[PDB]
DNA sequence: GATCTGGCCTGTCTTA
DNA sequence: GATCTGGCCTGTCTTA
DNA sequence: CTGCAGGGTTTTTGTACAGCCAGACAGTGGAGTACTACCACTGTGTAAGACAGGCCAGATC
DNA sequence: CTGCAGGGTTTTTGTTCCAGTCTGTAGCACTGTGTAAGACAGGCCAGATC
DNA sequence: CACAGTGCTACAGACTGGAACAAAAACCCTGCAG
C-alpha cells in the first residue's frame, strides 16, 4: 500500500487506508480465518456506504447505495456488536454513531451532503499560509488587511473566467 | 426578476502554529481563525407555481478556488470570550439579514434576492463549543440527537434527529 | 524594544538584542546602579568588537576597531572575570 | 554519501583545470576553504568530541578551566594533518 | 558493616 | 479505627 | 613551382540629379504619468552530549 | 422591359496520402490543508471527622 | 466519491505537396417565358 505512519491522520492517508486492497495487506497479518473474513466483509460494507455521504449529490451519482444505506448500516452495526463487542460494549466514537444513525435522514433533508463538507473551507487554509508570506505586507498592523484583500481577489470568478482562456 | 433565492454555505475553522510577529502591538496568541463563506446556489421561484428553480450551482464547492474569506483573526479557539466578542457583530448581521430581501442592480435591472444561510462547514468541536455543548468526548455524543454514550452502544442504527438551535436556547 | 519572547535565539532577534538601546531598556530593570554601568559598558565594548568579524573586510570598512580588538577584548575579559566572575 | 565528494576535492587540489573560455583555453588553480559550518558539525567531521566537551576550542587545545583563567591569550594549533596524527 | 563502582536521576552547561 | 470526599494520577477514550 | 605586376572579371560604395513623405524639434499647461525613497519588519539558522555530584543498590569480606 | 431557369464562368473551400515537425495534453505515482483539549471511570491515599 | 497541481513523459494532435476533385459562391449569360 506504500503508506507511512502519521501523528495526526490526514484524510489522504484515510483514502488510501479505507480501500479494500488496503485491508488486504492487513488481512494477511491476522492469523484467525473467520476474523480475516469478518473485518474484510466490514470494510466492503464501509466502501458501500461511504460514497453516500462523500459524494456531492448521491440522488443521481449513486442511487442504489443510498436506497440500501439503512439496511447496509444495520448489517454493519450487527457485525460490530457481534464479533467486535469487546471494543464497543460501552463506547462508540462520535462519528461511527453519527454515520450509522443520522446520515439517511440528513441526505433526505438537505438533498445531499459532502457538498456541504468542511473541505471547501479548510483547504483554503493552505492559501492563508502562503498569502501570509508571499503577499503579506509585512507588519502586524497591515498584514491581515492585505492577506484578506488578496484572498478575496483570489476567490473572485471574474478573474478565473479570464484564466480559463476559453479553451 | 424579484423572486430569487440565494443559498450560502458559511464555514469557520481554526488553525494552529502560526508564529507571532515581533511588531509593535498588541500582544496576540499564535493561533489564527479564518471565517469564510461560499455561494452554493442561486435559484428562482416566481411567478408562483413551480417549486424553486436552480440557475447557478457551484460545480466544485470543495475547491479552494471558491471560498470567500470574511473575518480573519488571531484568536485561540479555546477562549470563548474573545471569539464571541469579534464574531458577535457578524452573527448579528446574519440573523438581522435573514428577514430582509436584497436589492441589486444587475443586468441593467433592479432585482431582489432572498438569502438562505447554512453553516455546514464547522468541525464537531466548534459546533459543540458555539452551541454550548460539552465537548468533545462527553457522555452525550450526538450533536443532532439526545442519545448518551451507553444508550448509543446497545442501539445504533435507529435514531431521530432532535437537536436544533431554538431548542438548545430554551 | 518591540521584541516578542522567543523559542530559540534567531540571529535577527540577536541583532536587535545587542544594541545600546536594548541594554538601556533592560538597564531600568536592575536596581543596582553600579551594575547598570557594568553591563552597559560591557555591551558598548561588544558593539565595538562586533563589526571586526561581522563585516566583510574589516581592513577597509572598520580599521580602527580592528587595530583595537586585542586591547578591547582585554577590557572585556577583565570586566567579566572581575565583576561577573 | 559525502565520501566521493571529499575524494573529488582532495584529488582536485593538485591538478589545474583547463577551460576553453573567451575563445581561449586557460588553466585555473583551485583553493578550497570550507568555512561555513556550524561547530557541532565541524566537531563531527574532524572527530572532535562535542559539543559541551571540556576542550572547547576547535582551533585551540585549552580546557574549560584554562580558558577561564586566561581568556584573551591563545594560539591556534588545531588543523587537519596534526588531527590525523 | 562499608568500601567501591556504577547507577540513575538530577542537573546544569553548550550547540543545535 | 474508617467512612467520606476529593484529589491526583492514571487510564483509555474522543475531538482537534 | 614561387614571387609581383599590367589588366581582366564581377561586384562593391557612393556620389551624382530631383521630388516627398515622416517624424523630430519647440510650445504649452498640465495632465496623469512612471519610478522613487521610505517604513518597519521579516526568514533561514532547531538536538545531542559531557560532566559533577549525589547516593542508593548490592556485591565482596 | 421583366421574371427565373439552368447553363456558362472564375474563384472559394476543401478534399485523399505519404514523410515527417511542432505543440498541447494526458499518462505517470503522487502531494496539501485539516493538529488540542476534556470527560469518565476506578483506584486509593490523604485527611478530616468523631 | 476534495481538488489544483506535480515535471517529464507519452504521441495524440497541429503542419506540406501535388494531383484533382467536386461543391459552392456569386457573375455572366442564354434560354424560354408575361
Ligand atoms: Zn444522534
Ligand atoms: Zn581556542
Amino acid at each position: 500500500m506504500k503508506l507511512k505512519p502519521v501523528m495526526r491522520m490526514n484524510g489522504n492517508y484515510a483514502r488510501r487506508l479505507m480501500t479494500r486492497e488496503a485491508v488486504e495487506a492487513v488481512c494477511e497479518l491476522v492469523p484467525s480465518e473467520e476474523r480475516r473474513e469478518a473485518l474484510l466483509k466490514l470494510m466492503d460494507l464501509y466502501l458501500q456506504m461511504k460514497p453516500v455521504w462523500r459524494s456531492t449529490c448521491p440522488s443521481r451519482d449513486c442511487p442504489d447505495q443510498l436506497c440500501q444505506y439503512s439496511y447496509n448500516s444495520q448489517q454493519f452495526a450487527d457485525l460490530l456488536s457481534s464479533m467486535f463487542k469487546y471494543r464497543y460494549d460501552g463506547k462508540i466514537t462520535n462519528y461511527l454513531h453519527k454515520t450509522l444513525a443520522h446520515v439517511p435522514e440528513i441526505v433526505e433533508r438537505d438533498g445531499s451532503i459532502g457538498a456541504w463538507a468542511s473541505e471547501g473551507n479548510e483547504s483554503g487554509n493552505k492559501l492563508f499560509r502562503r498569502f501570509r508570506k508571499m503577499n503579506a505586507r509585512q507588519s502586524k498592523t497591515f498584514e491581515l488587511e492585505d492577506i484578506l484583500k488578496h484572498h478575496w481577489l483570489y476567490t473572485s470568478k471574474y478573474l478565473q473566467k479570464f484564466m480559463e482562456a476559453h479553451k | 426578476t424579484s423572486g430569487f433565492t440565494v443559498v450560502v454555505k458559511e464555514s469557520c475553522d481554526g488553525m494552529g502554529d502560526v508564529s507571532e510577529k515581533h511588531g509593535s502591538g498588541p500582544a496576540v496568541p499564535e493561533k489564527a481563525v479564518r471565517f469564510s463563506f461560499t455561494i452554493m446556489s442561486i435559484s428562482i421561484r416566481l411567478e408562483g407555481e413551480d417549486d424553486g428553480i436552480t440557475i447557478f450551482q457551484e460545480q466544485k464547492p470543495n475547491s479552494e478556488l471558491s471560498c470567500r474569506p470574511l473575518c480573519l483573526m488571531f484568536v485561540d479557539e479555546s477562549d470563548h470570550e474573545t471569539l464571541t466578542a469579534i464574531l458577535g457583530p457578524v452573527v448579528a448581521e446574519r440573523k438581522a439579514m435573514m428577514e430582509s430581501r436584497l436589492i441589486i442592480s444587475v443586468g441593467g435591472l433592479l432585482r431582489s434576492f432572498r438569502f438562505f444561510f447554512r453553516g455546514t462547514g464547522y468541525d464537531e468541536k466548534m459546533v459543540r463549543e458555539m452551541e454550548g455543548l460539552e465537548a468533545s468526548g462527553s457522555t452525550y455524543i450526538c450533536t443532532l440527537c439526545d442519545s448518551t454514550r451507553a444508550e448509543a452502544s446497545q442501539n445504533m442504527v435507529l435514531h431521530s434527529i432532535t437537536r436544533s438551535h431554538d431548542e438548545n436556547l430554551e
Side-chain angles (χ1 to χ4, degrees), chain A, chain B:
Chain A
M1 292 310 301
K2 298 306 178 52
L3 297 177
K4 262 310 196 69
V6 291
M7 316 261 289
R8 163 95 174 89
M9 187 170 59
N10 53 45
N12 188 36
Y13 177 69
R15 295 177 190 97
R16 215 100 66 204
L17 202 58
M18 208 39 77
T19 58
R20 184 168 181 182
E21 49 196 356
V23 144
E24 286 305 324
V26 178
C27 93
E28 183 178 2
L29 267 180
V30 183
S32 180
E33 298 311 311
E34 322 84 357
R35 300 291 294 172
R36 170 180 304 175
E37 184 276 333
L39 54 77
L40 197 154
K41 182 53 165 65
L42 191 70
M43 184 66 49
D44 183 74
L45 290 183
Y46 195 78
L47 287 179
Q48 277 313 99
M49 57 192 306
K50 177 167 168 289
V52 173
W53 44 277
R54 199 38 159 181
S55 188
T56 66
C57 167
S59 54
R60 142 190 73 194
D61 310 348
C62 51
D64 47 348
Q65 282 102 5
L66 169 62
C67 171
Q68 293 306 325
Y69 188 84
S70 298
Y71 165 83
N72 203 322
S73 59
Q74 183 73 70
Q75 181 159 334
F76 192 102
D78 203 351
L79 182 50
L80 279 189
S81 299
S82 175
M83 303 184 57
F84 294 108
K85 177 185 284 182
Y86 68 99
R87 181 180 179 88
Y88 296 140
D89 55 336
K91 52 188 183 183
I92 290 93
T93 182
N94 289 284
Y95 285 100
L96 192 53
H97 151 67
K98 264 184 198 172
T99 195
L100 283 177
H102 319 280
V103 172
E105 171 65 19
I106 68 181
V107 177
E108 161 137 41
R109 177 176 62 82
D110 278 342
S112 288
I113 180 197
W116 299 93
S118 186
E119 193 69 16
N121 193 353
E122 275 260 330
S123 274
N125 267 349
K126 171 203 280 293
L127 303 194
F128 182 88
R129 293 184 180 277
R130 246 188 8 249
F131 286 149
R132 194 203 175 269
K133 282 196 253 311
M134 309 300 102
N135 290 273
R137 175 88 73 177
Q138 157 168 316
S139 66
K140 298 210 302 181
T141 56
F142 296 107
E143 165 173 281
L144 288 179
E145 173 172 352
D146 61 320
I147 284 157
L148 179 51
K149 177 169 82 173
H150 193 281
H151 200 170
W152 185 274
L153 258 56
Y154 185 76
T155 325
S156 160
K157 288 297 172 62
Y158 187 79
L159 285 77
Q160 309 169 331
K161 276 300 180 51
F162 287 107
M163 186 47 71
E164 300 311 315
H166 162 219
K167 99 177 290 181
Chain B
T1 54
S2 197
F4 287 93
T5 286
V6 186
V7 173
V8 168
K9 167 190 85 171
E10 64 171 359
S11 184
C12 169
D13 183 21
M15 192 172 35
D17 67 9
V18 174
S19 77
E20 197 181 355
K21 288 190 161 299
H22 281 292
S24 37
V28 70
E30 286 189 323
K31 317 193 177 185
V33 173
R34 214 173 53 72
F35 185 93
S36 58
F37 73 91
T38 297
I39 287 186
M40 286 310 290
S41 48
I42 161 185
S43 54
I44 193 81
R45 146 161 276 277
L46 326 169
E47 95 186 305
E49 296 173 348
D50 154 30
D51 304 25
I53 289 295
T54 180
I55 286 95
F56 161 78
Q57 175 130 40
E58 174 67 20
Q59 214 48 224
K60 300 150 70 171
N62 290 346
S63 270
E64 65 265 17
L65 286 185
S66 83
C67 192
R68 292 285 171 105
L70 194 128
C71 208
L72 262 59
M73 302 166 293
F74 297 114
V75 178
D76 184 17
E77 237 172 44
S78 320
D79 67 18
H80 201 89
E81 305 216 282
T82 305
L83 183 64
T84 43
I86 313 293
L87 242 62
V90 171
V91 157
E93 37 233 35
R94 275 191 44 205
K95 256 157 18 284
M97 184 185 304
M98 282 294 313
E99 309 299 355
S100 102
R101 315 191 292 93
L102 185 54
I103 271 183
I104 307 284
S105 60
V106 49
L109 293 179
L110 226 47
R111 343 196 178 202
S112 181
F113 301 137
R114 295 191 44 81
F115 285 95
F116 294 162
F117 291 99
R118 325 277 178 77
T120 63
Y122 310 73
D123 38 23
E124 168 157 327
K125 168 181 189 171
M126 182 141 307
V127 169
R128 287 174 158 269
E129 106 170 3
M130 298 177 302
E131 203 182 339
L133 273 165
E134 310 75 46
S136 190
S138 295
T139 289
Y140 300 95
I141 43 181
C142 205
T143 301
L144 328 168
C145 190
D146 286 353
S147 165
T148 71
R149 182 57 57 85
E151 195 272 327
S153 188
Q154 180 177 56
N155 195 335
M156 296 178 156
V157 305
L158 178 58
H159 266 82
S160 62
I161 295 175
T162 49
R163 294 259 185 74
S164 70
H165 183 65
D166 54 348
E167 179 172 345
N168 290 270
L169 276 183
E170 140 182 39

